[PDB]
């Protein structure tokens, strides 16, 4: 047979010219059944068709073919466990995408791919089906239906071979969890291989930190329950004896700093081996070699062990490397935030010698802002220069605007509500604005604030606020009056060190008082101000306007933000009225908290707290009665009802109502011990303590000589005391703390409240 022509049928989409180019045979060629078979198998090999059929017609080589149907629609059903976009990402494999061509023969591959995907999610019993429907013009649509099954969970975590420690102590630090109480927050019983590897390396570190130089992990097995609901984890370990440290030595390309490195490497004899100390020593060697301008200092250490003496000798090798210089720093991805907003956070200077630790800590500084989802870094050698590089940062922004709401309860103030909206990166400028409000039983508050974190390039900040307040005293168990106020402040921040900073600013406040119940302590102040209200009536009012100068200082070296075990925190604040205002007074406060561990494991610690306050008028006038100090309650002295400590009211026509005083002193001492009866797997999440409290409040201006029939409220000798027990943990509803204490030294007007608690943020 000779090709007079080639005739096509069914080529509705695939080009006839493309097929004519694609066959191994052309017009005029001698053809047999072998060439016909080659043509049809080649057309099958093209992949555009599902059913190729060919024939030897009278005057042409006939090809009649149905092309592969084109998929025009993808739909899902029953997939609610996993996101539709996640399904779309998963189906990117195997050429399953809209607009392309496929066949029904590959459905099982999709089935098994989806099954494997949900197995990787942990849905070991999931099942999937597909339904396929064709359409004219050789179009086709498909739908996918999903059954999620049941997600497996970890049943037990077991360690065999340990003898030095109990298994619960080792389990307690792992990411995976086998027991989760309903009243605590410790995690979830999901299984992930990355978390398993992290737990394995944490277990290795836990033994390397205590002198077990010969520690090794033999094998690990993961087992599945026959119903495929539970997962079992078991690790095999073996540990030898503890080893002592005999000494260290260092050699290599030290580049002349050998004595300075050697003075850093010395360790006293008799200490146990410690991998954390070894790593810290080598990191300090890298840092010290890095401040001399080397870009990539490389160090390495291997331990030499002697099994006869149970001693380890440490060998360290150091390679200085070379010097590079930074030619340019570029940012990309910041399509909204200003360039300077990112460039401010860097620690590497452009046009200076490179520092790798500086680049990493600049990445961390940029990541701490929270404006970006992810941060990446790359160092690229500029072409044609042996020793110049460019540093490039990759960022992806996120929406910083949010609105938040909260609720809590406690004996101190009852039900509390919180609500507000905030925007941290206004127009990509770095400014922060927000509006906030709060309501308690006895107080209602609202404010609006604006803050510029960089008023000066060194970190000096500038901000202000505008507020409104509404305080009603009788609902707080005080003497009856009502105070509504508004004003505005402006303040500066000035950091001078990593741990402490200064503060200063100005402010204005306007006060309005009403419904004042007549009493001698209040009307002393009114007479001092020069007003003579009517003793028999309750319907008096008073107005004042003041300008104040504020300052402060804070010191904070605490070990960690939650459940600290070491450090101290001190805060001092002041206030004074500049001339031209109505009142003339000053006030100063100071409080202190410090932790002193008594155990090497930092599970037995001692806590001590204090609080002081003082204030008086400048001349002639007195401090207003609404600026007084208060004591008692869960915040100040446990065991006493809120605001009950101090002087008491004396009406004009004595009672348990407290009025507070213009001087205060409070002290406390507390012992923290491990919880006795919680299982060790999560015993560290609950803190239990015993305390001893004391404090007093007195009014320095009380003229005792004219009021012999009443106690002396100017005497600071009336010290109150109490002692008890308290405990706290993180509830699913939020932070939670309980207390029970009994006062063993009280006076006539003090009302006790033995059981106190608080739930959530208040």
């Amino acid at each position: 047979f000779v090709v007079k022509d080639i005739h096509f049928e069914g080529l509705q989409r695939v080009a006839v010219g493309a097929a004519l180019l694609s066959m191994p045979v052309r017009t005029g060629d001698t053809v047999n059944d072998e060439d016909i078979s080659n043509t049809i198998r080649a057309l099958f090999a093209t992949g555009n068709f599902e059913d190729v059929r060919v024939l030897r017609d009278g005057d042409t080589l006939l090809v009649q073919v149905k092309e592969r149907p084109t998929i025009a629609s993808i739909t899902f059903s029953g997939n609610k466990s996993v996101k539709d976009d996640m399904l779309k990402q998963n189906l990117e494999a195997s050429g399953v995408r809209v607009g392309e061509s496929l066949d029904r023969t590959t459905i099982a591959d999709i089935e098994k791919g989806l099954e494997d995907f949900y197995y990787s999610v942990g849905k070991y019993s999931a099942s999937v089906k597909a339904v396929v429907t064709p359409l004219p013009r050789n179009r086709v649509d498909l739908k996918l239906v999903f059954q999620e099954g049941v997600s497996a969970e970890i049943q037990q975590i077991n360690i065999v071979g340990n003898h030095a420690f109990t298994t619960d102590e080792l389990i307690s630090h792992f990411q995976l969890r086998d027991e989760v109480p309903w009243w605590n927050v410790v995690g979830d019983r999901k299984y992930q291989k990355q978390k398993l590897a992290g737990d394995l390396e944490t277990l290795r570190s836990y033994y390397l930190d205590r002198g077990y130089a010969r520690f090794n992990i033999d094998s690990t097995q993961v087992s599945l329950t026959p119903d495929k609901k539970g997962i079992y984890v078991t690790v095999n370990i073996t540990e030898g004896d503890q080893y002592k440290l005999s000494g260290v030595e260092v050699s290599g390309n030290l580049a002349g700093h050998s004595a300075e490195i050697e003075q850093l490497t010395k360790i006293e004899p008799g200490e146990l081996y410690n991998g954390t100390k070894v790593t810290k020593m080598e990191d300090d060697i890298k840092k010290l070699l890095g401040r001399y301008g080397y870009a990539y200092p490389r160090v390495q250490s291997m331990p030499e062990i002697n099994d006869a003496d149970k001693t380890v000798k440490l060998r360290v090798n150091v390679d200085a490397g070379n010097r590079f210089y930074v030619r340019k720093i570029r940012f990309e991805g910041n399509d909204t935030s200003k360039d300077a907003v990112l460039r401010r956070e860097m620690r590497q200077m452009e046009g200076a010698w490179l520092g790798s630790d500086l680049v990493d800590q600049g990445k961390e500084r940029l990541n701490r802002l929270g404006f970006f989802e992810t941060v990446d870094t790359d160092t690229q050698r500029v072409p044609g220069s042996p020793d110049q590089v460019d540093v490039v940062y990759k960022v992806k922004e996120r929406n910083t605007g949010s609105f938040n709401f909260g609720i809590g309860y406690g004996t101190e103030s009852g039900v509390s509500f919180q609500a507000g909206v905030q925007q941290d990166n206004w127009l990509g400028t770095g400014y922060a604005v927000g509006i906030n409000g709060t309501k308690n039983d006895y107080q209602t508050y609202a404010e609006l604030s604006v803050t510029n974190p960089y008023f000066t390039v060194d970190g000096v900040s500038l901000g202000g606020r505008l507020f409104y307040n509404d305080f009603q005293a009788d609902d707080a168990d005080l003497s009856d009056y009502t105070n509504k106020s508004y004003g505005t402040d402006v303040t500066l921040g000035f950091p001078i060190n990593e741990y402490n900073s200064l503060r200063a600013g100005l402010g204005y406040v306007h006060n309005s008082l009403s419904n004042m119940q007549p009493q001698v302590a209040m009307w002393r102040y009114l007479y001092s101000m020069g007003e003579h209200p009517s003793t028999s009536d309750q319907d008096n009012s008073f107005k004042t306007d003041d300008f104040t100068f504020n300052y402060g200082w804070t010191y904070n070296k605490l070990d960690r933000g939650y459940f600290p075990t070491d450090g101290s925190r001190v805060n001092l604040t002041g206030k004074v009225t500049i001339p031209g205002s109505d009142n003339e007074y000053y006030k100063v406060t100071l409080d202190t908290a410090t932790y002193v561990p008594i155990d090497d494991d930092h599970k037995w610690v001692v806590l001590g707290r204090t609080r002081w306050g003082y204030g008086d008028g400048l001349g002639g006038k007195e401090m207003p009665f609404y600026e007084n100090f208060y004591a008692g309650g869960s915040s100040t002295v446990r065991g006493f009802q809120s605001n009950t400590i101090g002087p008491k009211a004396v009406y004009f026509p004595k009672s348990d109502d407290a009025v507070g005083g213009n001087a205060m002193a409070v002290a406390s001492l507390e012992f923290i011990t491990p919880t006795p009866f919680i299982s060790d797997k999560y015993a560290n999440s609950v803190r239990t303590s015993f305390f001893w409290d004391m404090g007093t409040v007195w009014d320095t201006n009380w003229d005792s000589s004219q009021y012999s029939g009443y106690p002396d409220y100017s005497d600071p000798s009336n010290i109150r005391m109490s002692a008890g027990i308290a405990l706290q943990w993180m509830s699913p509803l939020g932070p939670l703390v309980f207390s029970y204490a009994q006062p063993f030294k009280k006076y006539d007007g003090d009302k006790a409240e033995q059981f106190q608690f608080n739930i959530g943020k208040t």
């Binding site: 004996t411 103030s413 009852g414 609902d475 009802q641």
Partner: peptide
Amino acid sequence: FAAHGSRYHRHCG
């Protein structure tokens, strides 16, 4: 005892 606000506490002795 009385329900002063939402807190429950002694207004008595």
